[PDB]
Amino acid sequence: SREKYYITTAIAYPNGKPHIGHAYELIATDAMARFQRLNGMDVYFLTGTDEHGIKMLQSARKEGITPRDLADRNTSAFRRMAEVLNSSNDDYIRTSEERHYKASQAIWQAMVANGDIYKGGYAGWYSVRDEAYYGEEETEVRADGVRYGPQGTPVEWVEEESYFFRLSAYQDKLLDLYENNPGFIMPAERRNEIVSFVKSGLKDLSISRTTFDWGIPVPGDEKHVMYVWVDALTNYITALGYPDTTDERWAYWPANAHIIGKDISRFHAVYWPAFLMSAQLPLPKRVFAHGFLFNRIDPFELVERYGLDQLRYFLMREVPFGQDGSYSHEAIVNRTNADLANDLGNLAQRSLSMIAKNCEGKVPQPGAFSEADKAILDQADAALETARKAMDDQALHLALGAIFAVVAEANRYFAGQEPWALRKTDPARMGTVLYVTAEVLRRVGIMVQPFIPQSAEKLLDILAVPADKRQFADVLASPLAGGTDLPAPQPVFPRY
Ligand SMILES: COc1cc(Cl)cc(CNCCCNC(=O)Nc2ccccc2)c1
């Protein structure tokens, strides 16, 4: 019985087209999910779309179609993005689906049963100019006879009927969660902003609207529809068949990792665990927030220009996962050409071309390993353990850095050994250097699979590695057998 691993992306708002922020999140989470599959886990990987709300109703009114029709049309682009990005998601969740309507209504009833939902209103001062709420003390009536907020704009007393979740009851329980799980909300900078926020006191949370019907109705009060909080976050349990706990997929709960953007960190580390606690459900083991990408841009055009695995590699390598980063035409071209086309690509071509020409297209029979041979072989084995430990802390750049440090060293190894000169001098020793090179390329090939799957598959194909020997366990246990026929080598990473 393989151990279970549930991982998710935050669900995208399909109000516009797919931006690069959505692509980045999906790529990172896809790589993590693939990594765990290869590491032996029973993986479930989810992504999807948040389709309700006032902005979506208004967009639909503008184009002269129903909100559902619009939701269908715009979400197809996000489905197509997942396909073009080579996403290995086992399901695609859409908030408009019946299964989500039932699951959101179920968790709402569970929270009503726990005594955490009441009907009331959100009565206070609102600045229409600042688009924010204020307490009375932050305001001041001026000579106008008009009340102003703290930013010098008028405020107006807005009053709207709303259901509330009793978030004020979960302060001490959430603080206990953070003390008992240091890794619940990462990276470290996110945690501190969450702990500081919860310490300063939590007020009860508005969870329904009366201003639009494009939403999930509130049970026993259909004039209200559910606001974003209960709707969007419940997608993670909808995908496992909630509220049916007899479903085969329900064993995947709790989620091992919710991968999200930094902007929605509060909603996944404060509101979401409070809801789960109220509904008598276990909490996710980690929420990891990534940073944003700036242009120092449409993900379909980037993939077409630079290549998919080139983009996947760059985003995961150059930006430390958690921090903000940049991408430019110059940076993508340089770093992919250097690491993929030159370092990994040419090392495969030079070595495997020598096997095709000098060793009759067969893996050479290796003799004794020198101290140089051992070092590069052991460094490749050690990269897997550094990669495993890094991926537990969502440090994708550190995983790729360790794997491509082996590639860089293997190039220096191959060059120092001078196999070309050994062809005349000592053919048997040439065979050993070429064996060692191919063997390191196999180990690297297996290890890079989650990050660059199609290109990794090609490399392993030209090493004649069978389909059932491409797990991480095969790095130590399934080395290349001398005498095996290899197909004619072709370049895996063409230069830009
Ligand atoms: C609820 O916290 C979030 C959870 C996830 Cl998984 C993702 C996000 C980020 N999505 C963008 C938010 C904009 N969408 C929105 O407000 N939808 C909405 C509005 C009213 C009623 C139901 C959904 C926010």
Residue numbers in the entry: 2 to 297, 309 to 508
What does the paper say about this structure?
Within the twenty aaRSs, methionyl-tRNA synthetase (MetRS) is especially interesting for it not only links tRNA with methionine for elongation in protein synthesis, but also links the initiator tRNA with methionine for protein synthesis. BmMetRS is characterized by the structural motifs typically found in MetRSs from other organisms: a Rossman fold catalytic domain (red), inserted connective peptide (CP) domain (blue), a stem-contact fold (SCF) domain (magenta), and an anti-codon binding α-helix bundle (green). Comparative sequence alignment data showed that BmMetRS clearly has one knuckle and is in the same MetRS1 family as TbMetRS.
We also identified 2 other compounds, 1415 and 1433, exhibiting ΔTms of 3.1°C and 2.5°C respectively. In the presence of inhibitors, BmMetRS crystallized in P1 with nearly identical unit cell dimensions despite differing crystallization conditions. In each structure there were three copies in the asymmetric unit that were roughly equivalent to each other with average internal RMSDs of 0.81, 0.35, 0.64 for 1312, 1415, and 1433 respectively. Binding of each inhibitor causes similar conformational changes to the residues surrounding the methionine-binding site (benzyl pocket Fig 5). Although the changes are similar in the presence of all three molecules, they are different relative to the conformational pose observed in the presence of substrate analog selenomethionine. Tyr14, which in the SeMet-bound structure forms one face of the binding pocket, swings ~50° to open up the binding pocket deeper into the Rossman fold domain. This allows for Asp51 to make hydrogen bonds to the “urea-core” of each compound, coordinating the tail end into the newly opened pocket (quinolone pocket Fig 5). To accommodate each substituted phenyl groups of the inhibitors, Trp230 rotates out and away to create the necessary space.
